[PDB]
Symmetry: C3
Subunit: 92 residues, 3 copies
């Protein structure tokens, strides 16, 4: 037997904002916290595995989510215009 779900998390600021990504049944979904209750975020993309990182540029948050199915990893980018596909490629 093995685990059936897999998560990744990032956070920023002192409130804080938290984003938790869960890969389950080939789909990644997003839960969000910014100090007043958990809610479902806009991120919804295919994937059996997820990782995430984020950084601030001044006050603006930038998020990168790496979603993998099979040997294909797709990078998704939050830069202030919704989620967009990133340039990331890998030869797996």
């Amino acid at each position: 037997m093995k685990a059936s779900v897999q998560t990744a998390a990032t956070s920023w600021g002192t409130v804080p904002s938290i984003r938790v990504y869960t890969a389950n049944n080939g789909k990644i979904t997003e839960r969000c916290w910014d100090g007043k209750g958990w809610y479902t975020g806009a991120f919804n993309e295919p994937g059996d595995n997820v990782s995430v990182t984020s950084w601030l540029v001044g006050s603006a948050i930038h998020i990168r989510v790496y979603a993998s199915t099979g040997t294909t990893t797709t990078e998704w980018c939050w830069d202030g215009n919704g989620w967009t596909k990133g340039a990331y490629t890998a030869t797996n």
Copy 2:
């Protein structure tokens, strides 16, 4: 399930402090580095999968560990005085 290690890691400051969480045999445990050697930490909760994030408020560390068993993810919170279950829920 059969013995098998999966980890998550976070760090803070410049020393740094590092915390590494290991899921194995249905339990998540914690190893700690504060600049002078590895030692075992207080975190010990059920789980087959783990992710983590942390943030500083001044010099106080806050840690959130997302422990998953089956399709249920439980958030565990360190805010300076023991690990407590957080409000996180998801619908997996």
Copy 3:
């Protein structure tokens, strides 16, 4: 089939990003510093991977936790190649 597993870290405001992929028992690394993705020097065995990093001034320090079976090896970047770290556990 078999799905790869990744871990990611980033630093600064450009930013720099490092993405580690565990694929068929080996962990490799892809890198971004603002001018395209390229393959990094990290190459170690592992079924599972996590990562963290911190800045000391402008200098990045990266720790990659690579696990096979019940054994986790820490790999350390401190400016001059990857070295095995002191991390141990009794899994």
